[PDB]
Design a binder for this molecule. Structure first.
Ligand SMILES: N=c1n(CCN2CCCCC2)c2ccccc2n1C[C@@H](O)COc1ccc(Cl)cc1Cl
Length: 156
């Protein structure tokens, strides 16, 4: 009863609500944070950071506190090149300034993500996370960091 998609795919979460540490842009594509939407199609259809390393993150602002019970991630196939995140951390905030890493079994939870570019993987957050902001912190990846996502939950 609390696993509704919050709006990444449907665009109920608007472009302005999605930001990142950095993003990659060249003459070919602009891999903006707001392209990080599950199942999005087109030439620029994922978020990619400017550089590949664990200091990078993607942020969503729900603009009120929500109950988050899951996140869904996907990579992207760009031309003939597979790109996906294999492992990631989550952090959260109510005020946008002070952040908290999601813990499980006594340590920061390392979420196991994707195994290809195109198939979604759902990761449950237990206990549920009550938060206004959510950040995803890629830790490992195949070839390049690329993300399309969804957030699952309900009202706080
Ligand atoms: N997790 C990664 N990291 C950093 C995250 N890690 C924790 C710190 C040490 C390295 C793993 C990578 C850095 C550069 C390149 C790949 C990285 N990965 C994913 C790598 O762990 C494995 O991914 C690959 C598999 C096949 C090919 Cl052809 C290419 C790649 Cl990249």
């Amino acid at each position: 009863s609390c696993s509704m998609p919050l709006g990444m795919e449907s665009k109920a979460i608007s472009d302005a609500q999605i930001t990142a540490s950095s993003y990659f842009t060249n003459m070919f594509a602009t891999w903006s944070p707001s392209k990080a939407r599950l199942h999005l199609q087109g030439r620029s259809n994922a978020w990619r950071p400017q550089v590949n390393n664990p200091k990078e993150w993607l942020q969503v602002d729900f603009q009120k506190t929500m109950k988050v019970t899951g996140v869904t991630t996907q990579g992207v196939k760009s031309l003939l090149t597979s790109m996906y995140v294999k492992e990631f951390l989550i952090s959260s905030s109510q005020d946008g300034h002070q952040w908290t890493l999601f813990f499980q079994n006594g340590k920061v939870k390392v979420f196991q993500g994707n195994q290809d570019s195109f198939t979604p993987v759902v990761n449950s957050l237990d206990p549920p996370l009550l938060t206004r902001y959510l950040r995803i912190h890629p830790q490992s990846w195949v070839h390049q960091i690329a993300l399309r996502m969804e957030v699952l939950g309900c009202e706080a």
